[PDB]
Structures are given as structure tokens and as C-alpha cells.
Write a protein that binds this ligand. Structure first.
Ligand SMILES: Nc1ncnc2c1ncn2[C@@H]1O[C@H](COP(=O)(O)OP(=O)(O)O)[C@@H](O)[C@H]1O
Ligand SMILES: [Mg+2]
Ligand SMILES: [Zn+2]
Lengths: 528, 107, 103, 210, 159, 110
RNA sequence: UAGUCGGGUGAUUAGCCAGACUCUAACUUAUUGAACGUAUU
């Protein structure tokens, strides 16, 4: 129609797509370029011309919330608060919304997930229904993609409908354009606390193929990832790389060259091995010679894991014992995945799963980890030592520079690495009627952890329930009661401080300082 | 009972920390017991107050062009009533007093 | 577990002749047989360890071979066994000889 | 808290009379210049820097309708209910967070010197001054409770950190006394006390210096 | 919506609602108008519009119970920092009504096409209709187009 | 686990060390030992227990020494059988405690 | 900085130039009906 033509020529994606569907060249190319066009910035990072991210979320009578609005950052949003403030509820609400995009990229008219009629409606809500409303942004040609998930309480006669058609409309564009000519696709993932699980190599999923591209969407919003699928996929990649003959020739050529250098260096004991390898190389060359995309995929993931996970310097597959084993170099020692600590394993699992999905969904990017998507992480500090908490957000953002991360944390150490604008904070005595969340007043990035505790997390830097925590205060008061001189009572307490905290303690130094200052003040007073 | 940070698995006995933890400040426990800096080392702004102090010491305690720039950066990033700025202000004031003493002694 | 001579008597009089057990076993043997004295092997492992990045795969293979040689050396007279390569070959020939239309 | 000196009535308060008029009607921006002259950009009760701020009825408008457009009664307090909810000290906490209170059992910083009643320990806690009994003790104790001057962690933390920043300087000045004469030394103490006039928590800093 | 009586009836049904909310807004210096189901509030005072949505919900419940409800997804705050429009009319930062830059640029495009005889009859008719609307909303724009394109061209077009 | 097993049943067996996971990878002796000493009042100042496991290749079997655990547990069991006594609580709460709640409550088997 | 407003230029829905704005904070919509603008009468 002429109206659609005008809008499409003005840069509107939905109009361009409508014209493509009715006339089924020009319009197809508009749609495809909208999704694929982008440029490399000054830092060498690919940036899509049309970004995809969640702009805004509204919750009405959902769990603890009567009516709540949240504005999200395009890059990183961190939600903080005490236990039971609804931080996990917020990520759950978002994940269910994203399930509608995933379902419709997989299948025309696919069904996403639903709000629970048993648990998700606020218990004391007078209207007996809940709404989760979201708006997504996809470039200036599609500034608003509104979705609403709704549910009425069990029993209620009036039933409240969801509104999901805009999600389906956008997901249809991705699906249809991809079928004609391959495009990069968005990644959606939820990692909740369910990600901490015991590992089992023996349990294998015989349900779908792992090398099929759309397997990247399998259980993506279930909360655990599928680390088992990663391991299967990684072994698959290894077998294909080993079986490719030229890489084997190149690898064999490299091994022969390394062995020849050792023999030239005076180690005559390895000459027998060199001759065997030279024979193997000659045989391989003689066998019919023909870079595997599989080899590149493997390399990308290995680098991602090693860059993001601090204790891991290498990861590889061994088959020589007669069973396929993934091994890692962890803190300089070669170990199996089963030997890793729970903290290391759980974090490895997160990054491995995410990297796998991004590689599978972004085949046309030089660096597939620069693809688009939304990733939700609950309790990012889960099982991490404070040392790792100081690195985790920086590492993630550097490895996945165009993902929108929405995370929850209880860690001041994590907050010390994040700008105040990214932080959303519950009011301290909320009770679930607060209307909009806001950022803290203090700048957190680069700040001391003790300040973040007190100014942002509302916790004393010294435990108030411990008597010894008050001794210095009491000591000072005693000193001031006796005109600055150590009396019997002040001396006793001084000795208690010394005995408890030690001769080199900051507390004793403070006490000493108080004595010195007060003695000098008193001397001045006497002179006057 | 604490493991040494550099333990390559051959430590005979597990031992108590040297510092008393009960009733101690969190920042001290992090640094003395858990070997973690109070500010995140991988953030540039974490080093600015340290650098500012070094610049003050290098220029005989006077606020030079370079020290002023960094002071302004600290002020701009952390804010007017930040701990970091107050510490910087404190450093300026103490160094001015130390220098005044030094001049009186020289005369 | 590792395979041991008197496993040949396990479930021999009921539970024998099951396809899945064969396939698993056969793949296992293949992986082990893909690609020398213990002292010589010990010396080769030591030399390869000193060199160790491209030779790391070869070192792991040689360490496995050494461990197997030691195990065979340590293993008892009552459990004396043919090499996995030979075992594989005999079974393959048996299958091809016996089963109709498999060559 | 600091002892305040109330200078002169602004002209706008003359027009509005209680009963006829209500506090929504008056222009706040006419009133603030005289408060900012008095208080100097700092809160009446906690002495923090004013950013989010409101004009505060010392005796509230509900319980005391007569005292509404009366210049004695008004003060510049930290926090602002318009801009954000959840503020836990000073004016807002007096009304909402603290329960019942006698208005007579509170230090009014214009009428009285708070230095008589309050003491600021370098560990960051405000405590009643040494040697108070009965009514004077009750007033010191209630002023602390009702404005939440210790119980607000944000304030407690900030005031503590402000004082511990200067305590190297306090210890360094006083060591230099056997060195120096009374004429030169008393200048330097006066120079330090001049600085703190334009700082947050200036009473807490004063008690560290003097 | 398609029935000729429905406009009148709908406006009547909102009469009491409009009375109450208009009066309430006037007390706090808020301007209020309604265009069918579209409610608009504006003010020069900061931080007074935040209370309006809650007020609306209460009033709707009072007058209509659960029959008429706010679409909470469509509640939007704006200011001079951001784009502001009311019923498809842009309010510019000089406090004047505007068609918006994008629409103006599109109209200029069509005039340029017409100048070189590239507009088909359908597009020409479209252009003429849109210029009448432009003349109603932003007469100054027409003056500027006359200056840019020659009064002769524009008069010929509007014949 | 050895105390618990023997409080429940005479000659009950507790849990063993794993041959695959519990032995150090570069152990020269190719076995692992867990040696524990318990205290039960001045009458029984030392209750020593050792759990042992040898690697797969088995040059020599290293046996666990659990008799003191069994002996003490027997005292608790036998005396309790005659006359009810208070019994010790043993519990491990690892990170597996973090798991979803199943709403479906199993009706009272008893 | 970013986003927004938009006077100009530009075979013109682009790009470029100039100037400006900043309550935590626009996402441009719908007919044949109704109303408004223009045309026809
Ligand atoms: N349907 C409901 N009605 C009312 N309160 C609810 C409902 N569901 C959950 N809650 C409350 O909401 C909180 C759930 O916290 P959660 O979303 O897990 O937050 P967090 O992750 O911050 O701990 C608890 O305070 C719980 O009692
Ligand atoms: Mg019409
Ligand atoms: Zn205050």
C-alpha cells in the first residue's frame, strides 16, 4: 500500500516487512540490512546500527508489588536490596516475557511462558489479577515493542488476557528473514540460583542434536543453563577438528617440526618418535588432501572461558583413556571438570553456556561474542571469593560487549566496580508500594567497600551486636569524664582493649592517640 | 583456621590469623585476613587518591598544576562531600602545616 | 573398573550377547588403540615433560602408555591378557567371518 | 547541631494568617534566602550539606496550627518528601518515624546553645554532655532520639568518616606545642577553626579540634 | 466507536470525571485536557505530576468501579529534555506547535519531487491534503516553503 | 557416617572414600587416609578412627580402622534399647541445601 | 558526553551546517464514523 511504502522508505522496519510479505527484493534487503548493518568502533568492537534492549518494566499486583516501574540501562543494570525485597521476582518477570520472543523465533505462533495463578498474584490485592508490562527497543525504526503478561487468581470468574502480538510480530521478522538468508540472532538467557547443581558427565541428553543452530535456544530461560549440552557440543567440535585432515596435517607438521628441533638440540632418544611422526605425516599428505568453521568455534569459546574465569588457563578434550574427558588447567594443575571447586565450576558453567549460545547464534560476525541479547543473572557473587568478586563484572562486560546485563547482588565488593547510574536500589522500609526505583546518591565505582556498606547497603562497618565493637567509644567517654587523665576505670578498659585487639591493632593505636591528644588538650587548659 | 594464599597443597598445619577479627572493622579483615584491597584494583579511579598523595609529596607539599588537575578529577568523579575528597583536603591542610613548621625551623 | 580376564565369566550363563554392550566396548577399544620398554618409555616421558605446547598431546599419550605398561608389568600371571589392538583385530575378523553379508 | 542566630523576619510571612491561609499557598523561594543566610547551606539538626531540602515546622502544623507562619518556628531541614520517599533523620523522621514526643523536650538551636547538652565523640556517636541530670539529661536524650542523630546509619557513618579524616591533623598540631610560643600557636588553631565553618558536621569537627 | 452517537455518549459519561479532575488539577496549577480516551496533564512546577496517576485510579474506581481502568503501559512522563507531543502535534522547545522535523522534511521531499514532475497523481493529492493540515497547525511553515520553493510553484501545486 | 550406621544397626557400615575422586592425583603411595580423633568426657579422652582407600592398581590393600567408632556407637545403641537416653545429632549442610520447594506433601506413611 | 528541539542547506524521508534544551522520564497513533482543515458546491 502507499502508506506502508511511505513509512518503509522513512525507515520503519514493520512496514518494510509487511510490504515484503504481501509481494511474496527491495523490501527484503531493507529488512535484512536493518538487522545486519553495523560498524567497528575505535576500540575494534563491532556495534550494530540498531540495538536491541529492554527499556522499561512495570509490575502491577505482582507478588509483593502493588505497582512498580523500573527504567533499565542499555548496557548494565544492577538491582540491590535486602532479602525479600523482590529482586528475584523482577528477573522472573523479565524472563517470562523473553520466553515469548524465544518461542516465536523457534515456531510460528509459538507459546511462551505464563504467570502463576497459584503464586504470582499479590496475596492482599483487591483486584485479583497481576500484570507484567515490558517495552523493548529495536533501533530508531522500531522504538517500541510493548508486551503484557497477565493472569487472574485461581477461582476468579473474570479472566485477564495477555497481550503478546508485538513480540510475535518482531520474532516473525527474525525467523522469516533468517530462513531466506542467514542473519545473526539475539541471545536470551536466565542464570538463577538453580545454576548451582552437582555435575554428572554420565547423564547425557538424547533429546535433540547439539550441533543444530536452534539448539542454542534449548532451555535458555530455565535458569540453570545446560552445561551438559556444552560438554557434548565441545567434544563434538573436538572430534570434527581431529578428523579434519589438513589441520591434522598442520598439527602433525607442527609436531614433526618441534620434534626435529629437539633432535637437532642433541636429544637422540626422541629420534625413533620423530621417524614415526614423519611417517604418519607422509601418510596423511598421501591421503587425499583438501579452515574448518568448527576449529574457529572451538578457539573462540576456549579464549572466552580462559579470559573470564580467573583460575582457568586452558581447556581441552582427551580421549586416550577410552572415554571423552574435558580437562582444564586450574591454578597451574591439570584437572577434570569434576575436580573443580563448586565456585569455579558454577562460574565456568555460566560462561561456557553463554559463549556456546553466542557462537551458534552469530555465525556472520568476526567475533560472535559481540552479538546482541539480554542476559539475566541472579546473585552474581554466588560462591565467589571476594578476590573474584572484584573482577567478575569487568570480565563479563569485556567478553560480551553488546549484551544487556540485568543482575542482582548482595556484594559491596561487586558494587565497587560499577557506576551509580547502573544501580537500582529499594527504599529501606518499602513494603511494596514504592512506585519507581532510583540510583544511590553515592558514586560506587572506585569507592571503598566500607563506605558502600554504610552508605548504600545500610549496614554498620563494625558489628553492633558485639560488645568489643563499643569499647573504644566507651573508653573515649571515660577519658572525657576524668578531664583527660587515665583513671583506674579508663586504665582497666585500655588494658582490655590491648589484651583483646593486640599491641599492633588499629583500635589500640586509636586509644593511644586519644590519650595523647586529651593529655595535651588538658595541659593547654591548665596553662590558660 | 586459614589457608595461606600461596598454598601449593603441601601446608602441614592450618593456623589462626594474626589479627583479632571479633569486633574489627570490615575493611581491616578484608586486607589483613582475606588479602583483598579496600578499593578494586582494576578501576583507575581507585588509584587517584593514592596518586594525589604522591604528587603532593613530590612537590614539597604545594598544590601544583598536576596535583590540582587530579584534585579536580577526584572532586568531579566522587563528589563534593565524598570521603575521598575530604581525605585529599585533609592531606593539603596537614602538608601546609608541616611546611610552615619546616620554615619556622629553617629561620 | 578396568577390564580383567575373569570378566569373561560374568553373566556368561544369562545376560550374554547384547548389542549395546558390544558397541560401547568396541568404541572404547578404538579410542584406546588410536595412535617399548618401561625404562625407555620412562625416559621418553621425562624428555617430553622437559620439552613441555604442541607436544603436550604426545606427552599425555606417552604417560598413558607408560601407566599401561607398568600395570601390565604389575598385573598377575592368573590375569595375563593380549594387547587391546590384537583383541580388537580378532573380534573384527570373527564378526566378518561369521555374520552373513558383513565383510 | 550548631547554635543559630535568627536575624530578621521576611516580609512575605506578614500577609498569611493561620486559619484563613494554609502552607501550600506561601512561596517557599521567598523564605529560603533568609534561612540560607542564618544556616549557611547546612541542615539545622544534623549539619549535613543541603541538597534535597524542605522548610520544617519545629512544632508541627497539625498539633500547633497557630504556629504556622511564625519566623521562630521555621527551619531548613535535610530531605524532601516531594523528591523521594524513605528519609530517616531530622525533620521527616520527627514527624513520621519517631512516635510521640514532647516538643518542650527538644533542643531548639535558635533559643539555646546545643554545646551545653550534646557531645560529639570522635568514634562518631552523639552522646549527652558530661554532668546532666533530670530535665537537661531528658532534653539531650530526646533530641538525639527524635532527630535520629545516631540511629541513621548514613549520618552516623558520614560524621564518623569526616572526623577520622582530620584526626592525624588534630594529633599533629597538639604535638607541636613544646616547640612553639602561645602567640604563633593560637593563630594556627584559629586558622583550622576558620576552615571548618564551611564544612559538613562542623560541631563534630569543632569538638575534635578544641 | 463506529456509531455516530458514541462520541456524544462517551463525552457525557466522562462529564463528572472531567469536572472532578479538572478542579483538582487547577488547585495545584496543572493544565488538564481530554481527547476521547487520551488524557493530558502539563505544568511548570516540578514534581507535581507524579501524584496524578494515583489520583486518577482512585477517581476511576469511585465513579466506574472496575469498568473503566487506566492503561498503565501508556502512562508517559515527558519534559523539555525530551520529545513532547499532544494528539499528533509536536510541542517544540520554543513553546510553539510544530509538525515535527521529520514530517517537515518529508513534505519538503514531496515538494522537491513535484518541482521535477516526479510526483504521481496519488502522491500529489496526498501532498495537497497534508499541506492543508500543515497550514492549520503551522502556517509559518507554509510561508517558509513559499520562500524556499517559489510562491509560483506552491500556488501551482495548490491549484 | 560410621557412628550413625552403628547407632541404627549393630555392625552397620558407614560411607567409604572414593577410589576415583578422594585419592590425590600425584600420590606416590597411591592411597588416601582420613584420620580423626573424638573426645567423650574424661572417661574416654580418645576415640581414634581412620578411613583408608587404595587406588585401583592395588599393590597392597589399606584397610580402614573403625572399631572405636563402632564400640562407642554400640554403647549408645544398647543402653538406649534398655532405657531411653538422649542421642547425639550429626548433620551436614553443604551447598546442595539450596534447592526448589516441591509443594506436593506426601501423606502420612507414618 | 548523551539524548532531544529545529532554522538552513541538500534531484531532498538521507547526509551536512548553524543555534538551542535538560522534573529519574514520549514510545507519532485510527475509518467509511465523529470532529477539525482544505477542496467541490
Ligand atoms: N504472591 C505474593 N504476595 C505477597 N508477597 C509475596 C508473594 N510472593 C512473594 N511474596 C514476598 O515477596 C518476597 C519474595 O522475595 P524475592 O522475589 O525472592 O526477593 P529477593 O530475591 O530480593 O529475596 C518475600 O518477601 C515474599 O514473602
Ligand atoms: Mg476520511
Ligand atoms: Zn538533617
Amino acid at each position: 500500500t502507499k502508506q506502508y511504502e511511505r513509512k518503509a522508505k522513512g525507515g520503519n522496519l514493520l512496514s518494510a516487512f509487511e510490504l515484503y510479505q504481501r509481494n511474496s527484493g527491495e523490501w527484503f534487503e531493507m529488512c535484512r540490512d536493518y538487522i545486519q548493518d553495523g560498524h567497528v568502533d575505535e576500540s575494534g568492537i563491532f556495534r550494530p546500527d540498531n540495538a536491541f534492549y529492554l527499556r522499561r518494566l512495570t509490575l502491577k499486583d505482582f507478588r509483593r508489588f502493588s505497582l512498580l516501574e523500573i527504567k533499565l540501562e542499555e548496557d548494565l543494570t544492577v538491582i540491590i536490596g535486602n532479602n525479600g525485597k523482590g529482586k528475584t521476582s523482577i528477573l522472573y518477570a523479565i524472563a517470562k516475557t523473553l520466553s515469548w520472543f524465544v518461542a516465536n523465533i523457534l515456531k510460528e505462533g509459538g507459546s511462551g511462558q505464563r504467570l502463576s495463578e497459584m503464586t504470582d498474584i499479590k496475596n492482599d490485592a483487591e483486584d485479583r489479577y497481576s500484570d507484567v508490562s515490558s517495552t523493548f527497543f529495536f533501533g530508531k525504526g522500531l522504538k517500541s515493542v510493548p508486551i503484557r503478561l497477565s493472569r487472574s487468581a485461581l477461582g476468579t470468574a473474570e479472566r485477564r488476557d495477555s497481550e503478546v502480538k508485538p513480540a510475535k510480530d518482531l520474532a516473525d521478522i527474525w525467523r522469516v528473514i533468517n530462513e531466506v538468508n542467514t542473519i545473526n540472532l539475539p541471545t536470551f538467557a536466565l542464570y538463577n540460583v538453580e545454576r548451582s547443581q552437582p555435575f554428572n558427565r554420565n547423564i547425557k541428553d538424547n533429546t535433540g542434536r547439539r550441533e543444530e543452530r536452534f539448539d542454542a535456544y534449548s532451555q535458555t530461560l530455565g535458569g540453570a543453563g545446560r552445561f551438559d549440552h556444552f560438554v557434548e557440543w565441545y567434544i563434538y567440535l573436538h572430534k570434527r577438528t581431529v578428523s579434519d585432515i589438513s589441520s591434522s596435517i598442520k598439527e602433525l607438521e607442527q609436531q614433526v617440526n618441534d620434534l626435529q628441533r629437539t633432535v637437532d638440540g642433541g636429544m637422540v632418544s626422541v629420534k625413533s618418535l620423530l621417524e614415526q611422526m614423519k611417517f604418519k605425516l607422509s601418510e596423511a599428505i598421501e591421503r587425499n588432501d583438501a579452515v574448518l568453521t568448527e576449529s574457529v568455534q572451538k578457539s573462540i569459546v576456549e579464549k572466552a572461558i580462559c579470559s573470564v574465569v580467573p583460575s582457568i588457563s586452558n581447556i581441552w578434550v582427551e580421549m586416550i583413556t577410552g572415554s571423552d574427558l574435558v580437562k582444564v588447567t586450574n591454578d597451574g594443575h591439570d584437572v577434570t571438570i569434576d575436580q573443580l571447586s563448586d565456585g569455579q565450576r558454577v562460574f565456568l558453567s555460566l560462561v561456557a553456556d553463554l559463549a556456546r549460545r553466542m557462537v551458534m547464534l552469530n555465525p556472520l560476525l568476526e567475533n560472535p561474542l559481540e552479538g546482541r541479547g539480554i542476559v539475566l543473572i541472579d546473585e552474581i557473587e554466588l560462591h565467589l571469593h571476594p578476590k573474584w568478586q572484584q573482577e567478575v563484572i569487568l570480565n563479563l562486560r569485556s567478553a560480551f560487549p553488546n549484551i544487556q546485563f540485568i543482575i542482582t547482588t548482595h556484594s559491596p565488593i561487586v558494587l565497587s566496580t560499577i557506576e551509580k547510574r547502573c544501580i537500582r536500589e529499594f527504599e529501606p522500609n518499602d513494603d511494596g508500594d514504592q512506585s519507581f526505583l532510583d540510583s544511590p546518591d553515592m558514586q560506587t565505582k572506585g569507592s571503598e567497600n566500607a563506605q558502600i556498606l554504610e552508605q548504600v547497603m545500610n549496614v554498620h562497618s563494625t558489628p553492633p551486636g558485639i560488645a568489643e565493637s563499643h569499647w573504644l567509644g566507651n573508653f573515649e567517654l571515660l577519658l572525657l569524664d576524668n578531664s583527660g587523665e587515665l583513671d583506674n576505670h579508663s586504665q582497666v578498659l585500655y588494658d582490655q582493649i590491648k589484651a583483646h585487639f593486640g599491641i599492633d591493632s588499629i583500635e589500640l593505636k586509636k586509644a593511644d592517640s586519644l590519650i595523647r591528644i586529651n593529655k595535651m588538650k588538658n595541659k593547654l587548659n591548665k596553662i590558660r | 583456621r586459614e589457608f595461606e594464599p600461596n598454598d601449593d597443597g603441601d601446608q602441614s598445619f592450618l593456623d589462626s590469623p594474626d589479627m583479632q577479627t571479633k569486633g574489627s572493622e570490615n575493611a581491616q579483615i578484608l586486607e589483613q585476613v582475606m588479602n583483598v584491597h579496600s578499593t578494586p584494583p582494576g578501576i583507575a579511579e581507585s588509584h587517584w587518591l593514592g596518586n594525589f598523595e604522591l604528587l603532593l609529596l613530590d612537590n614539597s607539599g604545594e598544590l601544583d598544576n598536576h596535583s590540582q588537575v587530579l584534585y579536580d578529577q577526584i572532586k568531579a568523579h566522587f563528589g563534593i562531600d565524598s570521603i575521598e575528597l575530604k581525605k585529599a583536603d585533609s592531606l593539603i591542610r596537614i602538608n601546609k602545616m608541616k611546611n610552615k613548621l619546616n620554615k619556622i625551623r629553617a629561620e | 573398573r578396568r577390564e580383567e580376564r575373569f570378566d569373561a565369566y560374568s553373566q556368561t550363563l544369562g545376560g550374554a550377547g547384547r548389542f549395546d554392550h558390544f558397541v560401547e566396548w568396541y568404541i572404547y577399544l578404538h579410542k584406546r588403540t588410536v595412535s617399548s620398554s618401561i625404562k625407555e618409555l620412562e625416559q621418553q616421558v621425562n624428555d617430553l615433560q622437559r620439552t613441555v605446547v604442541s607436544v603436550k598431546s604426545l606427552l599425555e599419550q606417552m604417560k598413558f602408555k607408560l601407566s599401561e605398561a607398568i600395570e601390565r608389568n604389575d598385573a598377575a600371571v592368573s590375569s595375563r591378557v593380549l594387547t587391546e589392538s590384537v583383541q580388537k583385530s580378532i573380534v573384527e575378523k570373527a564378526i566378518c567371518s561369521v555374520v552373513p553379508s558383513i565383510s | 547541631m550548631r547554635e543559630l542566630a535568627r536575624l530578621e523576619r521576611p516580609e512575605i510571612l506578614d500577609q498569611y494568617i493561620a486559619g484563613q491561609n494554609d502552607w501550600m499557598e506561601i512561596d517557599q523561594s521567598a523564605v529560603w534566602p533568609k534561612l540560607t543566610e542564618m544556616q549557611g547551606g547546612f541542615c539545622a539538626y544534623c549539619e549535613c550539606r543541603l541538597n534535597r531540602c524542605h522548610i520544617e515546622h519545629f512544632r508541627p502544623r497539625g498539633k500547633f496550627p497557630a504556629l504556622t507562619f511564625i519566623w521562630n518556628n521555621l527551619f531548613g531541614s535535610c530531605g524532601d518528601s516531594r523528591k523521594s520517599g524513605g528519609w530517616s533523620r531530622c525533620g521527616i523522621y520527627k514527624d513520621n518515624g519517631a512516635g510521640a514526643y514532647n516538643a518542650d523536650d527538644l533542643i531548639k538551636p535558635d533559643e539555646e546553645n546545643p554545646d551545653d547538652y550534646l557531645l560529639f565523640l570522635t568514634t562518631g556517636e552523639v552522646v549527652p554532655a558530661i554532668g546532666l541530670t533530670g530535665r537537661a539529661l531528658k532534653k539531650a536524650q530526646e533530641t538525639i532520639r527524635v532527630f535520629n542523630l545516631n540511629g541513621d546509619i548514613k549520618l552516623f557513618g558520614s560524621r564518623r568518616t569526616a572526623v577520622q579524616a582530620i584526626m592525624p591533623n588534630v594529633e599533629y598540631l597538639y604535638t607541636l606545642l613544646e616547640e612553639f610560643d602561645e602567640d604563633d600557636w593560637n593563630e594556627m588553631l584559629r586558622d583550622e577553626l576558620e576552615k571548618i565553618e564551611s564544612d559538613e558536621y562542623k560541631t563534630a569537627l569543632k569538638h575534635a579540634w578544641t | 466507536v463506529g456509531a455516530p452517537s458514541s462520541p456524544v455518549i462517551s463525552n457525557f459519561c466522562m462529564y463528572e470525571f472531567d469536572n472532578r479532575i479538572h478542579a483538582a488539577c487547577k488547585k495545584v496549577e496543572i493544565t488538564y485536557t481530554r481527547y476521547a480516551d487520551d488524557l493530558t496533564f502539563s505544568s511548570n512546577i516540578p514534581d507535581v505530576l507524579k501524584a496524578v496517576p494515583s489520583t486518577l485510579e482512585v477517581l476511576l474506581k469511585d465513579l466506574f468501579g472496575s469498568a473503566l481502568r487506566l492503561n498503565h503501559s501508556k502512562t508517559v512522563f515527558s519534559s523539555k529534555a525530551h520529545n513532547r507531543h499532544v494528539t499528533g502535534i509536536t510541542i517544540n522547545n520554543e513553546e510553539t506547535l510544530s509538525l515535527g522535523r521529520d514530517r517537515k522534511r518529508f513534505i519538503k521531499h514531496l515538494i522537491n519531487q513535484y518541482k521535477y514532475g516526479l510526483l504521481d497523481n496519488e502522491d500529489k493529492a496526498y501532498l495537497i491534503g497534508l499541506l492543508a493540515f500543515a497550514s492549520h497547525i503551522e502556517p509559518s511553515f507554509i510561508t517558509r516553503m513559499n520562500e524556499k520553493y517559489s510562491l509560483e510553484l506552491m500556488e501551482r501545486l495548490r491549484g
